[PDB]
Amino acid sequence: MRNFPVPYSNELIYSTIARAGVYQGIVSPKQLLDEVYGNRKVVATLGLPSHLGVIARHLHQTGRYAVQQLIYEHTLFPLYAPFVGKERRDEAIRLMEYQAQGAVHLMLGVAASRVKSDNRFRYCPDCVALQLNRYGEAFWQRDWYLPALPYCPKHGALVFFDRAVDDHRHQFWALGHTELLSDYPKDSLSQLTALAAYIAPLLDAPRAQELSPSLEQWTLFYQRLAQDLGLTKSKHIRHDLVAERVRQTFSDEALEKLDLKLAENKDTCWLKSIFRKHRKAFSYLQHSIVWQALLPKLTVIEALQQASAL
Amino acid sequence: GATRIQAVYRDTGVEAYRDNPFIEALPPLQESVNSAASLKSSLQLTSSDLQKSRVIRAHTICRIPDDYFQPLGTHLLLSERISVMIRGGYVGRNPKTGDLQKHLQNGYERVQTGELETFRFEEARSTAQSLLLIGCSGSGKTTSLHRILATYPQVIYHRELNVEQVVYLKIDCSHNGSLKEICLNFFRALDRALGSNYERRYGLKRHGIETMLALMSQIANAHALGLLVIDEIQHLSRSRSGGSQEMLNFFVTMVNIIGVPVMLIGTPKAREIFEADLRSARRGAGFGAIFWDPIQQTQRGKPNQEWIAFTDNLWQLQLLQRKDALLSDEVRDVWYELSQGVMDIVVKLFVLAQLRALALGNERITAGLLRQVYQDELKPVHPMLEALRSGIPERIARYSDL
Amino acid sequence: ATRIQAVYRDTGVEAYRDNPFIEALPPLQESVNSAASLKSSLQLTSSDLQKSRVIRAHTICRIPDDYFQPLGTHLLLSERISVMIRGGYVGRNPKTGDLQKHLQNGYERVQTGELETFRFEEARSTAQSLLLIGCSGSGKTTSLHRILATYPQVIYHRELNVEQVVYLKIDCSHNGSLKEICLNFFRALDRALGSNYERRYGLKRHGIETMLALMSQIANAHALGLLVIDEIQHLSRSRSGGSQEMLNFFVTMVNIIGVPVMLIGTPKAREIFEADLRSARRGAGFGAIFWDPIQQTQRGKPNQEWIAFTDNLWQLQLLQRKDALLSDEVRDVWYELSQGVMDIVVKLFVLAQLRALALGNERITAGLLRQVYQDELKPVHPMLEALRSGIPERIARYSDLVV
Amino acid sequence: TRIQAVYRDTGVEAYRDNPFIEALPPLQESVNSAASLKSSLQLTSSDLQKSRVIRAHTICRIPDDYFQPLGTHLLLSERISVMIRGGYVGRNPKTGDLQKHLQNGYERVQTGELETFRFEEARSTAQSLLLIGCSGSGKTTSLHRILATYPQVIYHRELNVEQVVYLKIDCSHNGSLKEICLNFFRALDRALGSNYERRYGLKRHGIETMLALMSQIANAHALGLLVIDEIQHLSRSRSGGSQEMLNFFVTMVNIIGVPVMLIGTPKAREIFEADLRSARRGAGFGAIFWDPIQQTQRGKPNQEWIAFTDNLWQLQLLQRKDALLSDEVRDVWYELSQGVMDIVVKLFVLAQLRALALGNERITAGLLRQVYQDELKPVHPMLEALRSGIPERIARYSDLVVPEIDKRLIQLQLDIAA
């Protein structure tokens, strides 16, 4: 490619490639895939893409954009980076430069969701106005595409519409304003916008690049937090106090909206699993909900620093 | 193909040219006094080169037409106009305040729908402006342009952005009034100046005429092309049915809507094509038409300073062991009479006369030798220069390109 | 068909400096000493008067294919051709130095303000084109072949990877269509090199303007110095192009690629170019060479060239009763029956020699030449009669001779 | 015809070490050229008294088995021999390691010791001859006899090239410019052993591809001549015009060497004679015209005509045969025949078969007059055209011939039997 667009601030690399396609008038998706990559047997995805390195070579002349910058500043990697581990994170980072499309989605256990969770395209009504009044274009943003939060952190709620990623797996789609956005009346809770705004700063943080605890570290940090809050018995649990803490902090409607409905009647529950020994990579929400319910005056960055300190 | 030059930003003093990098990376325009010496060129002609053998000494005389230029009193105006229309055509495509990207976003509708006038943003203006260049053949329409545009780096690469700014591009029409070969020649000239492959990527898919028209204009804005120059516009006069108007409309919709300035060079045979309609002429000739005429001996009752400063300056490039220190008025008179002011005939006649003077043995240039060379080695161009010499409008009405 | 390794030489011309294409050619020779490089004649014809009759008859048949005596008008053509070949490579200099740093430094210095004006790289302008027009039978192909025989065709540069095709000779399309001029080029590129092109680059979907680029992609990859188009008179009254489309190709090809083009034609082809200034200025790009039949007398004296050319050929006889001296009557009859045309000299001599050998009498007289003219030269009679008349329109009735 | 290669040197220097030239039969003077083609019927005295049927068949075999060379056979033979042996000079296989010679010459001319040098070997002037004449005047039978002297195919042990000295091709009655290549293939795969027509000469390829393959195959084998006989059969309408067929025949020089011989009626002359350009290339080695033999080319009647008449006269097989031939018979033969070799023997055999049919067993002048007035109705236009000597009626009726006279001979034999 001769003129690969410079990515904007806080934008998905998928939208960067889509804008590269829309700039040079490549209507046919196959031609675009051949020109950008050279292999017609790839899979396009939103967040955690693969085949990186060819894009960084397309941006070779500009010295700032490298593989690390694109990995940590234009994909959804920061959400999956600290919680998954250290050696697994390093292996995933090393693997993103290669052509293993399924490996990035498979090795990260948190990313191994099999069936896509709402593969439809999202957008925010107010953010498009700001983007048009500042940059002149419309593009996907890492704030909107949280894996399980359909809520913009600054504003109230997103607005879905037709089409989905899996509808056409060989095409890159770019949002358009004049194409009438499917705006219809929306109602949103005020207990989830706060969670979105609490999780949002984790995306843009230089400290998160070299900050990722381990499984045993996670277990020790959670046990120490439970000991400090006093919600645990002698080598046991209150088994109810942790329930009403999250019940008061977050309503049941929000939890059922996020598909984390409480099941304290049954032993098997995500909260109980978190309190117990940690055996895999829990998603970001399972940590953020507990963090906001237990320590409301600490944000994500210093919480991660305290967890990884000991 | 063309060397790529990194960009350095100066400080333009114009309020309208506030921060636009495209018109901040361009070299500054010189003054009127320096425009008559920034283009002049001449052969070295070492004074020790007169003692060499005939065969070696005669292979440097044949370099005079290629390496001799004297800027007249019109090249200044042409250069000023070119600079104005190449700097004022970038104010509508400022990349800093999100204005170039709006033009590209409007270009997806044309490549997707096929209708060129499909506006998506109503706040994207066009200020390209257009120029027309007409002059008799052999008067130096291309040799002046290749020396005026030679002061611009063509391909400039910006590092803060990732855009390769092609300052100017030079193409020419097809021998027939083609509709698709023009769009293919655009790609063929574009990838050669960039070392890419655009001709294969666009065209091998067997696209339609309108789709190709949209593809060409979209890549003409993906790279911030500043000036499009099409050479020998008289070619399209031999088009098919409708070929003499479709591209006349396309070249007035590229400069008025898309925003890329265009300059067209052609012999006076294209005036019939370009006078088809007022709305098809004035829009395509916004600056008007620049008419070029051969040098005239006398302007205000006295000998022209241009003709004298051309002839007397050329006279000092003689590789003759028995050359003349001064130029007699008789030699000048016969030289003008046997050339009729055309740029090409003067230099070619001088070179041929000098070569024959070397070959014969008598190394002195005289009116008789000039006449003999003219009658010997200028056979095809006799009747037309004769018609120009006569001055009768009826004779000039046919051919002679005037 | 043969690749010759290059050995580098030096030239005193400052315009060439260090140019591989110019300095790989033979050295610069003077015009007067370049006329002895073309002369050739039959050898061993000293004691072949006593062998037999069949041998002495078969030997004479090779005279037109081995006798070549340069005239005084070949110096100009040779000099023009050499200048055109060498001067077409100044623009296409392959050995480019560290231009990037120089241009960058100049651009920075003119942007800062220290320098007032800087000039960047510029492309090569149009190259010169020569027009050779002459009556048929004056040797417009033999002269070109013997002149170009001193320049090797394909030279391979060890340092580079481009095969320099110094010259290349084709003929115009027989029916005047552009599509076959575009194909004779590909055909001729294959008999001179070892690769194939007729099927690889002979795709029919390309238009004539696309054919321009298709042949450009191979005429610029190589270092083609000349492209001579013989028999240009066929373009007149063609089918594909109506007014000027035939040479609208060549003007663009010269402007863009820059390979010098030499056009060889017949006085019928003058009207093709003499129509407008745009095309006539390019037909006579580097002067126009017009040829005429040899004149018996020059000013008030007999021409020395005719006498020398006749007396040089007169010594190739293979008859037993050959005459050392040539009587003026025989020369007068020869010129009368030849009218100065080059071809009607060697043929009229060879046929007379063969008839004398077969008849039995080993001599040539005026009667024998007259009889062989009356018998064997029948189809040429009207045009030589037109030459005898000398009326411009009477000659102009036929369209392959100077009128 | 597969004849091996034997080399015998000749005194010409220009043919020093050319294997193809020396593989041909040795050069011969006029005596051998005119003596190797003479042929006549034996007609021993023992067959005079036998059945009329066998004698009738023997008489019918006369026109095929009788030939008398006239005064142009030696000229034609010499011209053809020179043409075949002069078309290999630029195509000779005697080319050693020329790379060393060229490299040494280039090295020496770059040092100033060698002033000049020549770097080309493609020295072969385009040789051709357009041999045309009146139809039936002997442009095919005499050409067959001349070309039969040279072997068609020569095989060299050291090399691996099959030299095709000559090749003759004919045109269909309707005629077209495309069937020529197919005829070339169908003649080559018979002269040689291969499957060129099946392997390469398919129906898919166009005429230009046919010509391109024809040039390559003519360069693979050393083709010394190309004979196209009676181009009159080629149509001027289906081909496309009166200039484009000339243009194709001119393009037929692109074949490397291969001096082509074009044979046709004088109606094709107007196609070539239009300017000195074609009057020069057409007659590259002179102009030779086939004409009917005149009785009196000089003041004395031609010895060739008298010898021909006498030799045909002594070929009579009759019970009552007169040795002497009347002068009136010869005068009548001229007047009815005008020197055309096609019809002289035809008239003789027709009259001497009608003699058998009537049982007269003798030849009379009145019978000659009767058979002339009776049998030759279709061919009269040429007869009175030649008697009047007008070339216009000769040319405008030169494509007329007697229609299937062998069949008429068959019913004549049937009537004789009945």
Ligand SMILES: Nc1ncnc2c1ncn2[C@@H]1O[C@H](COP(=O)(O)OP(=O)(O)OP(=O)(O)O)[C@@H](O)[C@H]1O
């Ligand atoms: N002002 C000038 N001073 C000196 N030489 C000049 C001048 N103008 C033109 N020439 C010479 O005259 C010739 C004109 O060449 P060029 O290709 O520019 O012609 P042109 O006018 O563009 O032709 P056309 O209209 O046919 O395209 C060249 O040899 C050039 O060097």
Ligand SMILES: Nc1ncnc2c1ncn2[C@@H]1O[C@H](COP(=O)(O)OP(=O)(O)OP(=O)(O)O)[C@@H](O)[C@H]1O
């Ligand atoms: N300089 C010469 N000196 C002597 N004989 C010559 C010379 N040039 C040509 N001839 C003879 O005259 C003949 C003319 O044939 P040639 O092919 O040269 O003609 P031409 O004029 O080039 O043809 P065309 O009309 O195709 O351009 C040559 O074959 C040769 O025999």
Ligand SMILES: Nc1ncnc2c1ncn2[C@@H]1O[C@H](COP(=O)(O)OP(=O)(O)O)[C@@H](O)[C@H]1O
């Ligand atoms: N020299 C000859 N003697 C006798 N008959 C001849 C002679 N030449 C030709 N013919 C007759 O001419 C006929 C063939 O004619 P042909 O030469 O094919 O005419 P064309 O060449 O015009 O087609 C044969 O049947 C043969 O009998």
Ligand SMILES: [Mg+2]
């Ligand atoms: Mg021009």
Ligand SMILES: [Mg+2]
């Ligand atoms: Mg010729």
Ligand SMILES: [Mg+2]
């Ligand atoms: Mg026949």
Ligand SMILES: [Zn+2]
């Ligand atoms: Zn928002």
